[PDB]
Homo-oligomer: A and B are copies of this chain.
């Protein structure tokens, strides 16, 4: 009985940004990301490519893997939820640098070119499109709490925490709100990087999960919960 919309042409949903706080959205914060640049040309320090320089720097090379952050971004951006324009990704570098990842970005799939992109971003503070029509990656002011939606539920991925069904958790949760997931891209460490911001801690599976699989597993649950398909 309801009259049809005047225009039925499928239109891309709006690109979510930090400025808009009202829309229900999924935030995924890739905390403890190990991204740091150093002159040899500046190269994103890698656990395998460079061990001596990190030893000379004195930081343990175990926590010197930008690959994990690369893999998490690949699965997060390629998930259908991002295609529906309901997911914006943040990265908190271990040093303390916060990076806003525009959902429109198409990061290079190979790791070598990804490193070339990061060194550009960390020094130039922004990455512009090839056709130059918006900033894809931009550094922003800490703390992350300001940039998150005004009404938002905060959680972080903990193995010790109780196991939950992600689809059920999102369903019981309110609607005007938004869900923020703190994922630890660190290879190994104490799950307290986001204790100051987060209000409670949850577990997704009984077995240990990688950063990449854990975020993708959480995204698919939101996709079913909101019927993103």
Interface residues of A, Cβ cutoff 8 Å to B: 46-48, 65, 67-68, 71, 74-75, 78-80, 83-84, 109-113, 163, 167, 205-207, 209-210, 212-213, 216-217, 220-221, 223-224, 229
Contacts and interface: CB of A to CB of B under 8 A. Distances in A.
A205 B80 contact: yes
Given A80-B209, A111-B111, A220-B221, 11 more contacts: A71-B71, A71-B74, A74-B210, A75-B216, A78-B212, A78-B213, A79-B213, A83-B207, A110-B111, A213-B216, A220-B220
A84 B212 CA distance: 18
Nearest to A167: B224
Given A71-B74, A220-B216, A110 B48 contact: yes
Contact of A229 (B205, B210, B220): B205
A112 B50 CA distance: 13
Contacts of A210: 74, 78
Nearest to A208: B83
Contacts of A113: 48
A163 B207 CA distance: 30
A67 B229 contact: no
Given A47-B110, A48-B110, A112-B48, A206 B220 contact: no
A209 B83 CA distance: 10
Contacts of A79: 213
A206 to B, nearest CB: 6
A221 B224 CA distance: 10
B207 A80 contact: yes
Contacts of A209: 78, 80
Nearest to A216: B216
Contacts of A205: 80, 223, 229
A67 B109 contact: yes
Contacts of A163: 229
A85 to B, nearest CB: 11
Given A47-B110, A71-B71, A71-B74, A229 B216 contact: no
A215 to B, nearest CB: 10
Contacts of A112: 48
